[PDB]
């Protein structure tokens, strides 16, 4: 299924030692099978290129379950693409019968972080969580970061 003329064997055939050397022939396994031995005769290769192999840092959690750390993330950077931008122009006349209502857990997200630099309208954000800067940089604009259940 792979175009063989561009493979080297179509081309190296036939000069004699097939690209692998007269002195230092292509033998079976001249260094070790696999990660042998990254602690004796491959150690330079294993630190560089992978510092941190060969130890134990520690706290064992027998049977981690991947729900107790779920918490999907969203910054204030989006937050307003979740309502339409075509529903951003109308509150940008200016006219504030709004903040809107954003229910970030109905979308998929829990943690509202604060990267952001979001506009001067208020928002009403029902998410399950907070950043310190998500609470500030919303309530400065008027609205409120609110707890989803």
């Amino acid at each position: 299924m792979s175009n063989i003329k561009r493979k080297k064997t179509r081309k190296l055939r036939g000069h004699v030692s097939h690209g692998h050397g007269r002195i230092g022939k292509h033998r079976k396994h001249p260094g070790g099978r696999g990660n042998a031995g990254g602690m004796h005769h491959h150690r330079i290769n294993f630190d560089k290129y992978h510092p941190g192999y060969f130890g134990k840092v520690g706290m064992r959690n027998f049977h981690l379950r991947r729900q107790h750390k779920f918490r999907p993330e969203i910054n204030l950077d989006k937050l307003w693409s979740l309502v339409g931008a075509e529903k951003f122009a109308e509150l940008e006349k200016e006219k504030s019968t709004k903040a809107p209502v954003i229910d970030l857990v109905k979308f998929g997200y829990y943690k509202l972080l604060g990267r952001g630099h979001l506009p001067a309208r208020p928002v009403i954000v029902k998410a399950k969580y907070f950043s310190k800067k998500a609470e500030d940089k919303i309530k400065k604009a008027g609205g409120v970061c609110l707890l989803s259940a």
């Binding site: 036939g14 000069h15 004699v16 007269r22």
Partner: protein, 132 residues
């Protein structure tokens, strides 16, 4: 009767002789068609004196007169009649050889049709056969 083409040049040649592949005199297994030797202690690869000569691009013939036949023409394999209608106005650089596959039945027409368009066929008198 066909005039040779396009006011002919003088076709001159670095080697006429063809290159004949080391040790092919010695063995019946080795064909005389050239291989480059790859092997280390070889005096032909190493280009010793009075051994023989390898190919290279330096013997390459003139770019005007490259693939030109003895007649100043260049070949064009014709396989049926309406390939000759390609040579209606290339009859002044090219020439046709009727293929080996083309039979004695049709060749009589290809020869007669190519006599009208004045092309110089390089093998008439093929499948003549002044017979059935």
């Amino acid at each position: 009767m066909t005039i040779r083409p396009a006011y002919r040049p003088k076709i001159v040649k670095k080697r006429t002789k063809h290159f004949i592949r080391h040790q092919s005199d010695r063995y019946a297994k080795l064909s005389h068609k050239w291989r480059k030797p790859k092997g280390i202690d070889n005096r032909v690869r190493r280009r010793f004196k009075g051994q023989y000569l390898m190919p290279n691009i330096g013997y390459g013939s003139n770019k005007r007169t490259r693939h030109m036949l003895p007649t100043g023409f260049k070949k064009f394999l014709v396989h049926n009649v309406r390939e000759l209608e390609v040579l209606l106005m290339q009859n002044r650089v090219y020439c046709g050889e009727i293929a080996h596959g083309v039979s004695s039945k049709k060749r009589k027409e290809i020869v007669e049709r190519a006599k009208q368009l004045s092309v110089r066929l390089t093998n008439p008198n093929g499948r003549l056969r002044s017979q059935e």
